[PDB]
Design a protein around this nucleic acid. Structure first.
Ligand code: MG
Ligand code: MG
Ligand code: MG
Ligand code: MG
Ligand code: MG
Ligand code: MG
Ligand code: MG
Ligand code: MG
Ligand code: MG
Ligand code: MG
Ligand code: MG
Ligand code: MG
Ligand code: MG
Ligand code: MG
Ligand code: MG
Ligand code: MG
Ligand code: MG
Ligand code: MG
Ligand code: MG
Ligand code: MG
Ligand code: MG
Ligand code: MG
Ligand code: MG
Ligand code: MG
Ligand code: MG
Ligand code: MG
Ligand code: MG
Lengths: 159, 171, 51, 125, 185, 57, 57, 226
RNA sequence: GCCUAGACCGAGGACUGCGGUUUUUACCUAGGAUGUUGGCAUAAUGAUCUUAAGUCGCCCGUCUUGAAACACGGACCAAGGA
RNA sequence: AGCGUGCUACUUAUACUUCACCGUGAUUGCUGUUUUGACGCUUUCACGAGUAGGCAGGCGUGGAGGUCAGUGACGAAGCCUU
């Protein structure tokens, strides 16, 4: 007999972290979520109300609705050959702000500051990020660092 | 293969913690510098916590034979893998170049032990200065005084398919 | 209607690269280099021979 | 060539595309038919099987429809039919229909000779 | 061999000519093929494309749409261009004086336009008084108001019209349309 | 007698990638379906008053 | 049969301007007047003859 | 009428040639300057190596910034990710070559396609021979031979590329407009090597095959295939 | 940079372009073969048919994952036949 | 002419390169010279496997409206035929 219940296969996914069982620290209940916020979804096993389905465990989405104890999150799920918009109601214990926003918003602030200061100094600045480039030429000093010659070692048994 | 001896020098990439990492040199017998730098990283990752991604090649130089027209005897110390285990061995070769002795070694372990290039580590190639350093008789027999030998049964190669005279093998 | 190789056709070579004429006239392909007779490896770079 | 000058006429395939096993069976006529069978060696183009008609064998558009003498052949059934070839005597030749009587054919040959029109079948009856 | 990143030998998927064999529509396509090929006015390229369209892609334009387009700010004396039929609207209380160029006019539409002091001209008369489409305003009829579009994309919770021959209480109203009869979709 | 293949996902990603996998289109205004009724109710009055103020201005 | 049309002209276009300006023949270094030659073809094949002059043909 | 238009054409061509003389002087000067900087860079690197040798040091060369990638594998039986990678490198046939500017992103791209390509660091003469013999531009999604500097100017003149030597320089010294210049270049369609490959292509160059990075032997391979 | 041996091809069809040499509103090798000589037109040349030789070529149609199959229909031909 | 290994040359797929031709798709231009074909002419580039299946353009047959003032007992139709 096959079993395909709601929480099938969530034995380790919905477990609490080792030595992290019990009461929820209240910064979880003090965070503020607004419509449009990007939030990660991670089911907390100790709160069984408002719990996400196992598909959304590990997914990141957009807050679209704010209720008394919960947020509505928009997820895009692949169903066959396209994506379907899913609207999941989650209690805030299963939700955390996504850290990718604060990094991109910081690059936006930094670009605005650099551009305005470069305009003040009358020069130009290039704001596009660059991939790591091959390193340039260089001279390696050998004072105190004369090359040491290595050789492959013979075979030995150590048991 | 047809090989050259290379001096490959490399190091770990400098860090703010360690701005002058130690330089390591290896003598590599490779057909070209692409295999020379590959073999270098192959042995450094067997001997040090380093990778090609976290390291840097500093120098690749050909090491030419000092006396390419002086007949020498070389002792080569090897570490090769067989079908069953891993073995150390020492063998001797007569040649005028160190590279040509290593080339003979690779042919010889291919012929006598079915050991491919990938299964062989050259631990050491040493030119034996003293005649007493020669341990193996198959090369010790050419260090005798006033060595002479004929070449009986000479076979002459013909340009034509048919020959009008009886073959001979004098020489 | 017919592509002509500038590496074979001299007229196409001059049409594309007018500097090929100066390169040939000035012998840039066989230019001698004036320098001193030096050998900078006599010292520690003889670390190549042995180490 | 006595006609309007043309490039050398190339026929990519000069034989006849004969239907598979029109040599094996009398009931199978040589008229080309495409094999539709699931296992057919010809439909699957095994080495050694017959060539098959495809658009790659198409004739050069500049030499297409020209007989070896360089003319396009137009079928003529009466003397008034030669009137459409008056200004095309060096590119079009007239071919007299088989069902034209020996009398009307003599009249067509005489008028074609008068007009300078070439006749592809000038002898028959 | 080639590793094709797209499908080979694909037709554009757009009409390059009218499907119609009307010789006079072909003459209009001739005139605007020349204008689109030679005037640099985007109007002529739009008109040339619109002359290829099928009947459902050229919905009738009521004389009320024209009245509303002429009631745009600064558009009272523009030339209204309809590549299609202009129909009458007996719900208008009044119609202005306007110049309208169309493929066809109904008797009521043309009568009203001329009654109010306007002109009802063809697209060839348009090409002479406005060879670059100067001071024109293209008006298109509603495409999604067609009855066939009511049934497009029918499905559960889609709100479209079922394909049905009779209408009444006994025709597709019970189970699946009502919670008292099972479910509702 | 009638034992056949039970299940297979073979060829399913190929079929999904012939015409997919297409991301959904984004629009400036998402639908407010499923948004809290109390908020939606008040937001109606707020938009109506904003439109009146801009119209008068 | 397909009758000829009025637009099927019979006029022969002129050839384009050819850029094949001839340049003189370059003979082998061994062909010097007074050289004894061996004829390989023709009626006098196999005959040893004296070479005298290079004609403009 | 024909003779009248010939006189007008002759006058207009006189004026056009007079105007083009200045542009050709400009590109002549540019080509001479590029040659000078090539020679100076070569001598500078040689001098730096000699100086490091003299001063008990080791000059480490600058890592190559440019690579020429040749697809030496057919179009059958390719897994989806390297297949997509080869398509994004515009290597959609065997013996197709492209210039790639080395960064982390492009290096990680090439690593996925490594079992199907042979690539390396191209010399200036190799680049020049490729562009001269098999250089084509992408003009309105059509493959147009680079037979005249006007073709290059009309498509890359907004990027200060006015000549085939400007294009070659922009490729060789990986320039600020490398993206536009290399994408304007249609993928090079090379022949098979004159002399063949090694006995078995589809194994790394280090192991005696042909795929992967061969690093200066791409020039010998290109000499074979172009 | 220079010299040198051979093979395959000659699409296009007034001019127009880009260059080069300029002794020049001229010429060029520079937006695709011309010049010259011989032979032939009772024919050298081309096509097809028959046949030999070399090489390859299993019986079609069908159902099937898989048919030349030791799976099934088919002796032959005409007319009819979905 | 076996086994292990290295090297040089060489052989040849409907694959790759250059060129010719067919078709498909795209693309340049064409009305005071559009000029009795603009559903036409023309420039350029790329591409071509295919069962089930879809579509397009054509070949052929009996009969019908129109037209060729069409062929024909001075031989229609049919049939045989390197
Ligand atoms: Mg966990
Ligand atoms: Mg409960
Ligand atoms: Mg089959
Ligand atoms: Mg192909
Ligand atoms: Mg009923
Ligand atoms: Mg009930
Ligand atoms: Mg099944
Ligand atoms: Mg060869
Ligand atoms: Mg091989
Ligand atoms: Mg020709
Ligand atoms: Mg056989
Ligand atoms: Mg069956
Ligand atoms: Mg059955
Ligand atoms: Mg079975
Ligand atoms: Mg079968
Ligand atoms: Mg059997
Ligand atoms: Mg049976
Ligand atoms: Mg049965
Ligand atoms: Mg039977
Ligand atoms: Mg029948
Ligand atoms: Mg052997
Ligand atoms: Mg071949
Ligand atoms: Mg096909
Ligand atoms: Mg089929
Ligand atoms: Mg009937
Ligand atoms: Mg009669
Ligand atoms: Mg008869």
């Amino acid at each position: 007999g096959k079993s395909r219940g709601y929480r099938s296969g969530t034995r380790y996914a919905f477990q609490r972290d080792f030595k992290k069982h019990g009461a929820i620290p209240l910064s979880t209940y003090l965070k503020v979520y607004k419509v449009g916020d990007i939030v990660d979804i991670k089911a907390n096993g100790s709160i069984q109300k408002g719990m996400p389905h196992k598909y959304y465990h590990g997914k990141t989405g957009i807050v679209y609705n704010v209720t008394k104890s919960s947020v509505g999150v928009i997820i895009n799920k692949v169903v066959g050959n396209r994506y379907i918009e899913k609207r999941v109601n989650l209690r805030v214990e299963h939700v955390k702000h996504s850290a990718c926003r604060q990094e991109f918003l910081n690059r936006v602030k930094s670009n605005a500051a650099k551009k305005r200061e470069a305009k003040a100094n009358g020069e130009t600045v290039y704001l596009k990020r660059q991939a790591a480039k091959p390193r340039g030429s260089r001279i390696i000093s050998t004072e105190g660092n004369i090359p040491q010659t290595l050789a492959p070692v013979a075979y030995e048994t150590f048991i | 293969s047809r090989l050259n001896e290379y001096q490959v020098i490399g190091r770990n990439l400098p860090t703010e913690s360690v701005p002058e990492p130690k330089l390591f040199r290896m003598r590599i017998f490779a057909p070209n510098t692409v295999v020379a730098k590959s073999r270098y990283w192959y042995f450094l990752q067997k001997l040090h916590k380093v990778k090609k991604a976290s390291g840097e090649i500093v120098s690749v130089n050909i090491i030419s034979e000092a006396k390419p027209t002086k007949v020498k005897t070389f002792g080569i110390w090897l570490r090769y893998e067989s079908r069953s285990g891993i073995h150390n061995m020492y063998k001797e070769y007569r040649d005028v170049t160190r590279v040509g002795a290593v080339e003979t070694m690779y042919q010889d372990l291919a012929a006598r032990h079915r050991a491919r290039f990938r299964s062989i580590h050259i631990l050491k190639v040493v030119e034996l200065e003293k005649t007493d350093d020669v341990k193996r008789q198959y090369v010790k027999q050419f260090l005798t005084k006033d060595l002479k030998f004929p070449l009986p049964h000479r076979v002459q190669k013909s340009k034509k398919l048919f020959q009008a005279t009886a073959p001979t093998t004098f020489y | 209607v017919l592509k002509k190789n500038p590496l074979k056709n001299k007229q196409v070579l001059l049409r594309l690269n007018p500097y090929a004429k100066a390169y040939a006239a000035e012998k840039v392909g066989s230019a001698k280099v004036e320098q001193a007779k030096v050998k900078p490896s006599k010292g520690q770079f003889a670390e190549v021979l042995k180490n | 060539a006595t006609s309007v000058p043309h490039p050398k006429i190339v026929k990519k395939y000069t034989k006849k595309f004969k239907r598979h096993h029109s040599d094996r069976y009398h009931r199978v006529a040589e008229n080309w038919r495409k094999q539709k069978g699931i296992d057919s060696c010809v439909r699957r183009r095994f080495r050694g099987t017959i060539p098959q008609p495809n658009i790659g064998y198409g004739s050069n558009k500049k030499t297409k429809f020209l007989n070896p003498a360089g003319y396009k052949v137009y079928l003529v059934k009466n003397v008034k039919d030669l009137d459409v070839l008056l200004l095309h005597t060096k590119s079009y030749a007239a071919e007299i229909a088989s069902s034209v009587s020996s009398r009307k054919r003599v009249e067509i040959v005489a008028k074609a000779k008068k007009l300078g029109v070439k006749v592809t079948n000038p002898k028959g009856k | 061999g080639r590793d094709h990143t797209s499908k080979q030998h694909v037709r554009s998927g757009h009409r390059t000519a009218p499907k119609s064999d009307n010789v006079y529509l072909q003459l209009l396509v001739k005139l605007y093929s020349f204008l689109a090929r030679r005037t640099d006015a985007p109007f002529n390229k739009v008109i040339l494309k619109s002359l290829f369209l099928s009947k459902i892609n050229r919905p009738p334009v009521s004389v009320s749409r024209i009245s509303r387009a002429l009631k745009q700010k600064g558009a009272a004396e523009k030339t209204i261009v309809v590549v299609g039929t202009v129909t009458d609207d007996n719900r208008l209380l009044e119609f202005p004086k306007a110049t309208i160029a169309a493929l066809r006019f109904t008797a009521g539409a043309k009568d009203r336009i001329l009654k109010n002091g306007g002109e009802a001209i063809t697209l060839d008369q348009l090409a002479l008084r406005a060879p670059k489409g100067q001071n024109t305003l293209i008006v298109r009829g509603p495409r999604n108001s067609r009855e066939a579009v009511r049934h497009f994309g029918f499905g559960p919770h889609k709100g479209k019209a079922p394909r049905i021959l009779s209408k009444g209480r006994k025709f597709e109203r019970a189970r699946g349309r009502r919670r008292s009869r099972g479910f509702k979709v | 007698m009638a034992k056949s293949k039970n299940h297979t996902a073979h060829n399913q990603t190929r079929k999904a990638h012939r015409n997919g996998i297409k991301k959904p289109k984004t629009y400036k205004y998402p639908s407010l379906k499923g948004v809290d009724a109390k908020f939606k109710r008040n937001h109606r009055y707020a938009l109506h008053g904003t439109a009146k103020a801009l119209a008068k201005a | 049969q397909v009758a000829p049309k009025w637009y099927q002209s019979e006029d022969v276009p002129a050839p384009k301007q050819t850029r094949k300006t001839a340049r003189p023949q370059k003979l082998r270094a061994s062909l010097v007047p007074g050289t004894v030659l061996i004829l390989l073809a023709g009626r006098f094949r196999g005959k040893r003859v004296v070479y005298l002059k290079n004609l403009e043909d | 009428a024909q003779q009248k238009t010939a006189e007008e054409r002759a006058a207009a061509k006189k004026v056009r040639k007079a105007a083009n003389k200045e542009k050709r002087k400009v590109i002549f000067d540019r080509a001479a300057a590029y040659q000078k900087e090539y020679t100076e860079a070569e001598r500078s690197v040689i001098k730096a190596k000699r100086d490091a040798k003299a001063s008990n040091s080791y000059y480490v060369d600058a890592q190559p910034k440019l690579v020429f990638v040749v697809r030496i594998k057919g179009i059958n039986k390719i897994p989806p990710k390297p297949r997509k990678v080869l398509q994004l490198l515009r290597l959609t046939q065997i013996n197709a070559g492209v210039f790639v500017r080395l960064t982390k992103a492009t290096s990680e791209l090439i690593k996925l396609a490594e079992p199907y390509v042979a690539y390396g660091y191209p010399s200036l003469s190799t680049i020049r021979q490729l562009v001269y013999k098999r250089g084509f531009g992408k003009v309105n999604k059509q493959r147009i031979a680079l037979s005249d500097n006007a073709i290059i100017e009309a498509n890359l003149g907004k990027f200060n590329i006015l000549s085939i030597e400007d294009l070659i320089h922009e490729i060789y010294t990986v320039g600020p407009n490398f993206k536009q210049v290399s994408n304007f270049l249609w993928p090079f369609k090379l022949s098979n090597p004159n002399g063949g490959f090694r006995a078995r292509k589809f194994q790394h160059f280090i192991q005696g095959g042909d795929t992967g990075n061969r690093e200066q032997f791409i020039n010998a391979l290109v000499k074979q295939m172009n």
